[PDB]
């Protein structure tokens, strides 16, 4: 159809920015679009399954895992899930990690077939935190901003997101309406059920919601999905009867299926003038897997790295004194306001959606925060500094170093990918020892001010002139300039990661 | 699941634990389950907490024999224990668990002894990135025990030598009235008895006892000890005459008759079988099936839920094979010159390059990092077993080839290689050589150019199926096509096959299958790049009645083992055919088979096991096998590990006495080699120092007895210090002269040896094998060329032992005797020397006849092998008029065919262009031999090609094989060959001394 053709065109234009948001809006107008869209993907997906072009695989996956998670109802006549299952069941011959993506999708598809709507209910229940006793889990959203660095538009976005729009009563209303719609198709009058619920108290609503979620999970646990679906449909009919509103359901005449946009999760905003993340630890006073602290750091290069320093710092602090994990299995999300550039070069999807940066920006932010689910690590260079008085300290840096404004003992072990530790000693009198991050790891190009010259290194040691104190910088930071240093070792070292789409 | 019970070390009685295991679970998962259950069930759980699961092995009995569940990644289903129990209706399973145990000090001492004998440690695991060698070592255990069980200690110890071919006609002249005289030396008596050619040793001994039953006293045979306790033995040598075979069927008797020498034998008690014990095996047998993965039905995924997927059949995958090349690093440059260097990768099956790809050239340096992906057009499902992923580093300005390295895409146990890899690349020393197929890495991991690659892993192993040869149901051909096809089949082995012919053969392959000779040509046409064709071919080979009924043809079977064919079943049927060969033919072809072992893609084959069995079943073959392999280990760094494994798997079953003999021989050779190296490093001083050193060696532990390498029946004794000396040569060999340690030796002749250093002999060893094969052919043709093979051998890097032809002088010396050092070559010199050495005219005539024979034989052989351009300073002649060559080590723009100097013409008397009876006899014999030989063009060509491939180190090109073909005059009438050979003879006659004189000048220069 013309609308279907436009859907395909928009999807194609996306594959090659705001295309994602535009597509989301377009599909959100009619429930039918969903199925239509899901068809086109399984067409294009199959294409790659033969052409063996790896790159396009990762984006489509997300789109699919997005589209299915938003559709309101799947008529039992529709078999599109079987088509997806068969299409993805033949990817296991693919290399790693694509097989991981396909395995996760297979698990998700089995879940959906057994008991539709499970994924939506789980996501919303975790987001709003109205979790059941058997499955007690929650979610958080923290927006750390530097008012000056973060532009006024970003500030408006954060303020809007921290706005407490919804209420738990509305959460129960939406969750029950969505579950019944998805399960019973159009044979229910959502208006009548909504009217009956609006009179119902919070306690009874929550009890019914908990029971419905328990029935959902139980059905998802059943072996045969075909029988499980009917079993759960009957159970929900019995639940509606017992509560006292069965009439709205099962209506012989179908209604008009309604799209249910995902709700808005809790959000709290804090100023973060400091580049030290410790601010968060304070809010702690104010289970790891039961919830996560989706810290949302606004991203500026200059400070990007200087704050990454803080991140890694507290990373070590908790790795040695794990307490934050006991509360939340943390997750971090950078937000360009070159830690992004690296992500984009590795994962182009990120480069085209996150790096490009309710209002369009807010929707994009929500989407990104909710679907980017692939932690990526960054390379980093550990070092140990021994001072005049025998004091020894361990530091970690990623940008560069500056040692000087002397008879510097300079030893270094260049390396080969093959693994040839070509040691070398250059005990030369130098003044300014500037480490440059030239760019499978890499080699900082050590610099020296004697006739100048600069060369790469892999693992280095510098010894001063008979306990000579030499100033050392940290990633160009003129604030933290350690001194009284006599010895300096440098070498590359290897839940709270740098969340990326990957 | 699978209910299985595991016995447990801890007792008051050994504990048991019944367990259910995944039907398709592997051994690792089962081990984890067993350890976890034991941690709970254990009466003393601390005992099992202290140790890990790896500190125990799983031994289960099968009819009484413990087998160990070795392969930790094999699937539980393939285990033969389950199948055997089902046959036995034993359940739930019973698997004893035994903690590891450190090897006994005795075991360590024995292991070090074997390492010393081999000359290279086998237990090392340094230059390896796999487990194939240890796995093969454990695998080979079963054949050793099986063969040892079925061996008669008596005959095994006596190891009589026999054969079964008909007597050559000329030799039937010597035997008359079907009887011959045998001399018996006993104590101090010599009695001659006439016995028919068809009287076995037992019958002859019984008849002799009956004759002399009244006179045992003089014979000095105790009355108690009856005939049972005495058997014949050849006087002066350790070779017996026992068994049940006509007296003419023992090689020694035929040799004596050929030599015209009265047969002498002496009674002696049987050698003790107890000396042949083998140390009780120190290992449990490894399970039966390890190299079988299953049928494609089970290993595929379609029709299975992903949660129930244990493995992915390789054929299911259908992408393009893809690899990632990271970089190349070398410590120091190879040269100082700006040259672009690019890596080139290829996929090769056999010698056929399935596909190629090349990278980007870059300014060469010590380090060059690419990190680039290469995708071959070939899909993953069409990877045949044994494919080689060749890698090369072409240094451009064509681009020189600097290094390379091979790699098996599929490892031994049928699991696609996956993960990271760091290889060490060999360095180059034509078109092809046997070196490029080495699967090993460079031991010098310090200063050897190394490369790094990456192959994408998978969430599961990608195994390979095993074919399910379900019968194939798959009329008459046009007669013209039949004629064309047959003509194609009739071409020479080397004749290339066009695409059209290949398609025809494959299309009409059921036609060819009805003809054995077509087999080698039929498999070349097969396209290896498709799974479907492979399946069809295996179906074709399933029906193998025609090949089986085919009479054994060694020449044909050799063609199969060439590198062309890397199929599992092709070489299996070839070995099957070889299984029928008797012992003597094996002695003939042993060196060529050992060479062919190189081409086998994997460490364990059918060929290796066949060799092991034949060696263990006999002594003599075992001896020669030992020396050949030991020579291979020392030299060829490419394959030292494989031969080391095979030889170790051997030496553990030979026995005791054999081990002691190897010990003594190796010690003596090492001492002499050390002295030789010390001496050659630097006049009469040299001789005095050598004699002093020999005296010291006597003062040292230079054993007094040892079987000579190239002649096990001959026991060397104590050196004759005075008779030794140093020859005058650019390499200065040593001249040793031992004396036999047998007190019963008839004569006092010494045992000569020449000990050469600083030169490889393998070329000479191979050429001598070729000459022996040719001699066998001619004997089958009922002639006598009186060729002179002598036993040469190599026993290390540039060290060799050579038999000494007694009473033998080079032709150059004879020339110097009269002419001196000018260059003139009078023809009367050789005749005068021979006549002087032969005062009796009858002796003179016999010597002339033998001289003509040997000259003809050697001329033919050298011409056939195309090495007849021998300088006039490498040919020897015996006082008996016999002639022969030596020094086949340097020979591997006029080009004379072969040396037929005019002096030979004078010897035969027909100087100039005149002729006489002698010359015509020479020509007649030459032509007879030449045609009889051309009757085996296939065998000659295949052996020569194998020699070139696995012989000289430098790269070889088809030009050599082109020449060889040309020479024999393949596919030409008998008269054409006669004319061609006579033309060669006349060309040799015409030139005269010109070429040899030029050679003399060049050597002087
Ligand atoms: N099998 C043999 N029996 C007796 N003498 C031999 C034998 N082989 C070589 N010689 C002697 O060794 C000398 C040739 O040595 P060789 O190493 O072949 O040549 P070169 O002098 O070029 O090194 C000759 O004097 C020859 O008599």
Automatic annotation (TrEMBL), chain A:
Could you tell me which InterPro entries the record lists for this protein? PIK3R5/6
**Localisation per UniProt entry:** Cell membrane; Cytoplasm; Nucleus
Q: How does it sit in the membrane?
A: Peripheral membrane protein
Membrane found in the keyword field: yes
Tell me the Pfam families matching this sequence: PI3K_1B_p101
Q: Name one GO molecular function term.
A: 1-phosphatidylinositol-3-kinase regulator activity
Organism per entry: Sus scrofa (Pig)
| Record carries keyword Phosphoprotein | no
Report the superkingdom from the record: Eukaryota
Q: Recite the UniProt keywords alphabetically.
A: Cell membrane, Cytoplasm, Membrane, Nucleus
This one is known as Phosphoinositide 3-kinase regulatory subunit 5
GO annotations of cellular component type: cytoplasm; nucleus; phosphatidylinositol 3-kinase complex, class IB; plasma membrane
From TrEMBL, chain B:
Any one GO molecular-function label of the UniProt entry: ATP binding
Pathway, per Swiss-Prot/TrEMBL?
Phospholipid metabolism; phosphatidylinositol phosphate biosynthesis; Lipid metabolism
**Catalytic reactions on record:** a 1,2-diacyl-sn-glycero-3-phospho-(1D-myo-inositol 4-phosphate) + ATP = a 1,2-diacyl-sn-glycero-3-phospho-(1D-myo-inositol-3,4-bisphosphate) + ADP + H(+); L-seryl-[protein] + ATP = O-phospho-L-seryl-[protein] + ADP + H(+); a 1,2-diacyl-sn-glycero-3-phospho-(1D-myo-inositol) + ATP = a 1,2-diacyl-sn-glycero-3-phospho-(1D-myo-inositol-3-phosphate) + ADP + H(+); a 1,2-diacyl-sn-glycero-3-phospho-(1D-myo-inositol-4,5-bisphosphate) + ATP = a 1,2-diacyl-sn-glycero-3-phospho-(1D-myo-inositol-3,4,5-trisphosphate) + ADP + H(+)
Annotated ranges, domain PI3K/PI4K catalytic:
720-993
Q: What class of enzyme is it?
A: transferase
Q: Where in the cell is it found?
A: Cell membrane; Cytoplasm
Where in this chain does the record put each PI3K-ABD domain? 1-101
On subunit structure and binding partners, the annotation says:
Heterodimer of a catalytic subunit PIK3CG and a PIK3R5 or PIK3R6 regulatory subunit. Interacts with GRK2 through the PIK helical domain. Interaction with GRK2 is required for targeting to agonist-occupied receptor. Interacts with PDE3B; regulates PDE3B activity and thereby cAMP levels in cells. Interacts with TPM2. Interacts with EPHA8; regulates integrin-mediated cell adhesion to substrate. Interacts with HRAS; the interaction is required for membrane recruitment and beta-gamma G protein dimer-dependent activation of the PI3K gamma complex PIK3CG:PIK3R6.
Q: What is this protein called?
A: Phosphatidylinositol 4,5-bisphosphate 3-kinase catalytic subunit gamma isoform
Taxonomic classification, please? Eukaryota, Metazoa, Chordata, Craniata, Vertebrata
């Amino acid at each position: 159809t013309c609308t279907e053709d436009r859907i395909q065109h928009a999807l194609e234009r996306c594959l090659h920015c705001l295309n994602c948001w535009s597509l989301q809006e377009l599909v959100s107008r009619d429930p039918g679009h969903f199925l239509i869209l899901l068809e086109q993907i399984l067409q294009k997906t199959r294409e790659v399954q033969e052409k063996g072009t790896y790159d396009l695989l990762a984006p489509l996956a997300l789109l699919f895992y997005s589209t299915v998670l938003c559709t309101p109802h799947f008529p039992p006549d529709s078999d599109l899930l079987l088509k997806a299952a068969r299409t993805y069941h033949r990817f296991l011959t693919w290399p790693v990690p694509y097989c991981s993506i396909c395995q996760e999708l297979l698990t998700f598809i089995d879940a959906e077939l057994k008991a539709p709507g499970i994924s939506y209910q789980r996501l919303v229940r975790a987001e709003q935190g109205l979790s059941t006793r058997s499955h007690r889990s929650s979610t958080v959203t923290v927006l750390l901003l530097n008012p000056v660095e973060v532009q006024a538009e970003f500030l408006d976005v954060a303020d809007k997101l921290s706005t407490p729009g919804p209420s738990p009563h509305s959460a129960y209303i939406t969750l029950l309406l969505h579950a019944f719609q998805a399960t019973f198709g159009a044979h229910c009058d959502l208006s009548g059920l909504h009217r009956r619920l609006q009179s119902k108290t919070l306690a009874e609503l929550e009890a019914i919601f908990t029971e419905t979620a328990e029935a959902q999970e139980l059905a998802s646990g059943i072996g045969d999905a075909a029988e499980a679906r009917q079993w759960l449909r009957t159970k929900l009919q019995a639940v509606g009867e017992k509560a006292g509103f069965p009439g709205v359901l099962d209506t012989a005449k179908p209604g008009k299926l309604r799209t249910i946009p995902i709700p808005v999760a809790r959000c709290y905003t804090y100023s973060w003038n400091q580049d030290s993340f410790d601010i968060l630890q304070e809010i702690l006073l104010k289970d790891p897997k039961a919830s996560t602290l989706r810290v949302v750091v606004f991203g500026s290069d200059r400070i990007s790295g200087k704050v990454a320093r803080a991140y890694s710092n507290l990373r070590r602090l908790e790795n040695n004194r794990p307490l934050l994990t006991r509360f939340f299995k943390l997750q971090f999300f950078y937000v360009p306001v070159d830690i992004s550039h690296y992500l984009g070069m590795l994962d182009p999807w990120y480069e085209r959606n996150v790096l490009g940066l309710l209002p369009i920006l807010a929707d994009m932010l929500l989407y990104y925060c909710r679907f980017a689910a692939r932690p990526v690590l960054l390379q980093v260079y550990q070092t140990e500094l021994t001072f005049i008085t025998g004091e020894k300290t361990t530091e970690i840096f990623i940008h560069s170093l500056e040692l000087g404004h002397l008879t510097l003992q300079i030893i270094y072990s260049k390396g080969a990918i093959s693994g040839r530790s070509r040691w070398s000693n250059m005990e030369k009198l130098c003044t300014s020892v500037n480490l440059s991050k030239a760019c499978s790891t890499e080699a900082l190009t050590l610099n020296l001010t004697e006739s100048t010259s600069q060369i790469k290194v892999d693992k280095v040691q510098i010894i001063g002139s008979n306990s000579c104190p030499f100033a050392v910088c940290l990633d160009q930071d003129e604030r933290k300039i350690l001194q009284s240093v006599i010895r300096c070792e440098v070498s590359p070292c290897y839940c709270l990661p740098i969340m990326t789409f990957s | 699941l699978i209910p299985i019970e595991f016995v447990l070390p801890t007792s008051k009685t050994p504990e048991t634990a019944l367990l259910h295991v995944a039907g398709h679970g592997n051994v690792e998962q089962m081990k984890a389950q067993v350890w976890l259950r034991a941690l709970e069930t254990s009466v003393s759980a601390d005992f099992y907490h202290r140790l890990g699961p790896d500190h125990f092995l799983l031994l289960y009995q099968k009819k009484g024999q413990w087998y160990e569940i070795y392969d930790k990644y094999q699937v539980v289903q393939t285990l033969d224990c389950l199948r055997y129990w089902k046959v036995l209706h034993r359940s739930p399973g019973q698997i004893h668990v035994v903690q590891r145990h450190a090897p006994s000090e005795e075991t360590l001492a024995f292991q070090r002894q074997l390492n010393a004998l081999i000359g290279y440690d086998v237990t090392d695991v340094s230059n390896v990135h796999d487990d194939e060698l240890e796995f093969t070592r454990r695998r080979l255990v079963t054949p050793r025990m099986a063969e040892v069980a079925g061996r008669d200690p008596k005959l095994y110890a006596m190891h009589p030598w026999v054969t079964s071919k008909p007597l050559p006609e000329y030799l039937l002249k010597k035997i008359t009235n079907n009887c011959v005289f045998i001399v018996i030396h006993r104590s101090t008596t010599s009695q001659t008895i006439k016995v028919s050619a068809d009287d076995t040793p037992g019958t002859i001994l019984q008849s002799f006892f009956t004759k002399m039953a009244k006179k045992k006293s003089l014979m000095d045979i105790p009355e108690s000890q009856n005939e049972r306790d005495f058997v014949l033995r050849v006087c002066g040598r350790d070779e017996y005459l026992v068994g049940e075979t006509p007296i003419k069927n023992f090689q020694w008797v035929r040799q004596c008759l050929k030599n015209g020498e009265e047969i002498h034998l002496v009674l002696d008690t049987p050698p003790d079988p107890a000396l042949d014990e083998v140390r009780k095996e120190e290992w449990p047998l490894v399970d039966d099936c390890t190299g079988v993965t299953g049928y494609h039905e089970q290993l595929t995924i379609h029709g299975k839920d992903h949660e129930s997927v244990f493995t992915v059949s390789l054929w299911d995958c259908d992408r393009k094979f893809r690899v990632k090349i990271r970089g190349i690093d070398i410590p120091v440059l190879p040269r100082t010159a700006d040259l672009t260097v690019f890596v080139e990768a290829n996929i090769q099956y056999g010698q056929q390059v399935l596909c190629q790809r090349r990278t980007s050239p870059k300014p060469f340096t010590e380090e060059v990092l690419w990190n680039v992906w290469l995708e071959f057009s070939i899909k993953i499902k069409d990877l045949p077993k044994g494919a080689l992923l060749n890698l090369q580093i072409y240094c451009g300005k064509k681009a020189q080839l600097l290094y390379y390295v091979n790699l098996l895409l599929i490892d031994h146990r049928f699991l696609l290689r996956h993960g990271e890899y760091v290889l060490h690349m060999w360095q180059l020393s034509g078109s092809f050589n046997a070196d490029k197929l080495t699967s090993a890495t460079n031991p010098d991991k310090e200063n050897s150019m190394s490369i790094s690659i990456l192959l994408d892993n998978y969430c599961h192993p990608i195994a390979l199926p095993k074919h399910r040869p379900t019968p194939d149901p798959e009329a008459e051909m046009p007669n013209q096509l039949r004629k064309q096809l047959e003509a194609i089949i009739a071409t020479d082995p080397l004749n290339p096959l066009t695409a059209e012919d290949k398609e025809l053969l494959w299309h009409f392959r059921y036609e060819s299958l009805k003809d054995p000779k077509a087999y080698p040509k039929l498999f070349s046409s097969v396209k290896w790049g498709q799974q479907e064709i492979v399946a069809k071919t295996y179906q074709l080979l399933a029906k193998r009645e025609v090949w089986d009924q085919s009479a054994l043809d060694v020449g044909l079977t050799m063609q199969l083992l060439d590198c062309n064919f890397s199929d599992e079943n092709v070489r299996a049927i070839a070995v099957q055919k070889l299984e029928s060969l008797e012992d003597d033919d094996v002695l003939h072809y042993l060196l060529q088979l050992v060479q062919a072992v190189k081409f086998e893609p994997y460490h364990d084959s059918a060929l290796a096991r066949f060799l092991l069995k034949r060696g263990l079943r006999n002594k003599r073959i075992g001896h020669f096998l030992f020396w050949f392999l030991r020579s291979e280990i020392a030299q060829s760094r490419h394959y030292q590990q494989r031969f080391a494994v095979i030889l170790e798997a051997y030496l553990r079953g030979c026995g005791t006495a054999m081990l002691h003999d190897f010990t003594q021989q190796v010690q003596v050779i090492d001492m002499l080699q050390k002295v030789t190296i010390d001496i050659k490093s630097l006049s009469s001083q040299v001789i005095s120092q050598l004699k002093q050193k020999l005296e010291n060696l006597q003062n040292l532990n230079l054993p007094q007895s040892f079987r000579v390498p190239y002649d096990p029946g001959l026991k060397a004794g104590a050196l004759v210090i005075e008779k030794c000396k140093v020859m005058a040569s650019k390499k200065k060999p040593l001249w040793l002269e031992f004396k036999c340690a047998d007190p019963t030796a008839l004569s006092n002749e010494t045992i000569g040896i020449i000990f050469k250093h600083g030169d490889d002999l393998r070329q000479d060893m191979l050429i001598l094998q070729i000459l022996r094969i040719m001699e066998s052919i001619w004997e089958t043709e009922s002639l006598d060329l009186c060729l002179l093979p002598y036993g040469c051998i190599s026993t290390g890097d540039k060290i060799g032992m050579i038999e000494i032809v007694k009473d033998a002088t080079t032709i150059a010396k004879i020339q110097q005797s009269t002419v001196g050092n000018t260059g003139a070559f009078k023809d009367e010199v050789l005749s005068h020397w021979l006549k002087e050495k032969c005062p009796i005219e009858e002796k003179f005539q016999a010597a002339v006849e033998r001289f003509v024979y040997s000259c003809a034989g050697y001329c033919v052989a050298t011409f056939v092998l195309g090495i007849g351009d021998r300088h006039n300073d490498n040919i020897m002649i015996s006082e008996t008029g016999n002639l022969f060559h030596i020094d086949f080590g340097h020979i591997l723009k006029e080009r004379v065919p072969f040396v037929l100097t005019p002096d030979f013409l004078f010897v035969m008397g027909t100087s100039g262009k005149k002729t006489s009876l002698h010359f015509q006899k020479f020509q007649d014999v030459c032509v007879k031999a030449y045609l009889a030989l051309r009757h085996h063009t296939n065998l000659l060509i295949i052996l020569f090609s194998m020699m070139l491939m696995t012989g000289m180190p430098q790269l070889t090109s088809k030009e050599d094989i082109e020449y060889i073909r040309d020479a024999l005059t393949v596919g030409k009438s008998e008269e054409d060959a006669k004319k061609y050979f006579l033309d060669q003879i006349e060309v040799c006659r015409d030139k005269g001394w010109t070429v040899q004189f030029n050679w003399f000048l060049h050597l002087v220069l």
